[PDB]
Structure 1
């Protein structure tokens, strides 16, 4: 099955998921000189005051911080969106070294990591139905650079020891994802896809311009996770990013001048 190796990594995905070579795949390189300012875009509305985190999971590809999405508690609205999108989970992608890790790139620059806050459009009732629709998901993407520590991340970092291997989970209540956001909500937006299989073309991407800073120590703890299951040969969870895909017939729009 799919992964991030020589034998099963992104360059192989298309054999099981032919949409890999589709018209609206993610991630992409954001060419800042060609992304046009769109005065019709709205400010983003990120309403996470009532978000209810429940659990953290190592799924063998990343770790997921999961939320109770059984009510409108943590929602994304505005920006490029019509309607209301409920937070279901966040996860990251990162590198073996600080010079790579992000999925999106900015004028070909790779950041050390990228955070994905995944939301589904409430008009479709559940996540599984939403991923079948072109406007089913909104993913908020936030770059990480290595510098100062992010205090708001440390709760996440310190639980990782308990979910080292694939299939491990841990109770993870009361975590506030507001602590992961940068000061500005300036963004780029474009239509795209999930970045892991099944690679469905269901996402409005919203990529923030301003990275967050995390410390080397924080990112180092991400790189101690394992792709493998308990008591299998250790293969560190690093370089779990899909490279940029062809933009094709898409426009990337900027919310800012």
Structure 2
């Protein structure tokens, strides 16, 4: 199956997922000079006060922190979005070294990692139906740079020892994703896709301009996870990022003048 190695990584994905060469693939490089301020964007609303996290899972590609999405609690609205999008999970992409790891780039700059908060459009009822729609998903992307520790990330870091290998999960209740945001909600937005197979072209991307800082020790613990399952040869979970894809017939809009 697909992965990030030489033999199953991004350059191979198109053989089983031909949309990999599609017209609205993600991630992309964000050329900050070409992105245009858009006065039609409404204020962005990140409403996570009632978020209910449930579990953390090593799925062999990354780790997902999963939320109860059976009611409107943690939701994303406004900005480029029509209607209400419900938080289902977050995960990260990261590198083997601090100089790489993000999926989106900013004027070709790669960050050490990138956080994706994944939401589905409630008009479609369930995530599965949403990924059959052009406006089914909204992903809030946040860059990570290495510097001071992010206190709100530490609970995630400290559970990773218990989900080292593919298929392991652990209870992860009462985690507040508000502790992963930066101060500013300035953002860029464009229409794109999932960045892993099945690469479906359903996503409104909202990428925050301000990175969060995490400590070297925090990101080093991400890099101790394993792609492999228990009992199998150790393959460190690093460099689980897809590189930038062709922008094709798209424009990136900025929320800020």
1:39 Cα deviation (Å)? Answer: 1.1
1:43 Cα deviation (Å)? Answer: 1.9
Instruction: Choose 33-42 or 204-213, whichever is displaced more.
Output: 33-42
**Structure 2 counterpart SS, 1:54:** strand
- The superposition leaves residues 188-227 of structure 1 with CA deviations (integer Å, 9 ceiling, x where unpaired) of 0000000000000000000000000000000000000000
1:40 Cα deviation (Å)? Answer: 1.1
CA–CA distance in 2 between the matches of 1:70 and 1:38?
33
CA–CA distance in 1 between the matches of 2:71 and 2:123?
13
- The superposition leaves residues 217-256 of structure 1 with CA deviations (integer Å, 9 ceiling, x where unpaired) of 0000000000000010000000000000000000000000
Q: TM-score, length-normalised on structure 1?
A: 1.00
**Structure 2 counterpart SS, 1:110:** coil
CA–CA distance in 1 between the matches of 2:126 and 2:16?
25
CA RMSD of aligned residues (A): 0.3
CA–CA distance in 2 between the matches of 1:233 and 1:137?
36
CA contact (8 A) 1:43 1:185 kept: no
CA–CA distance in 2 between the matches of 1:144 and 1:44?
21
1:48 Cα deviation (Å)? Answer: 0.2
1:59 Cα deviation (Å)? Answer: 0.1
CA–CA distance in 1 between the matches of 2:44 and 2:184?
10
CA–CA distance in 2 between the matches of 1:43 and 1:248?
27
1:216 corresponds in structure 2 to 216
Q: TM-score, length-normalised on structure 2?
A: 1.00
1:157 Cα deviation (Å)? Answer: 0.1
CA–CA distance in 2 between the matches of 1:31 and 1:68?
36
CA–CA distance in 1 between the matches of 2:43 and 2:162?
38
- The superposition leaves residues 18-56 of structure 1 with CA deviations (integer Å, 9 ceiling, x where unpaired) of 000000000000000000001111221000000000000
CA–CA distance in 2 between the matches of 1:42 and 1:24?
23
- Kindly report structure 1 stretches of 4+ aligned residues shifted beyond 6 Å: none
- The superposition leaves residues 133-161 of structure 1 with CA deviations (integer Å, 9 ceiling, x where unpaired) of 00000000000000000000000000000
5+ unaligned residues in a row in structure 2: which ranges? none
CA–CA distance in 2 between the matches of 1:42 and 1:142?
20
**Structure 2 counterpart SS, 1:43:** strand
2:228 corresponds in structure 1 to 228
**Structure 2 counterpart SS, 1:142:** strand
- The superposition leaves residues 155-177 of structure 1 with CA deviations (integer Å, 9 ceiling, x where unpaired) of 00000000000000000000000
1:78 Cα deviation (Å)? Answer: 0.1
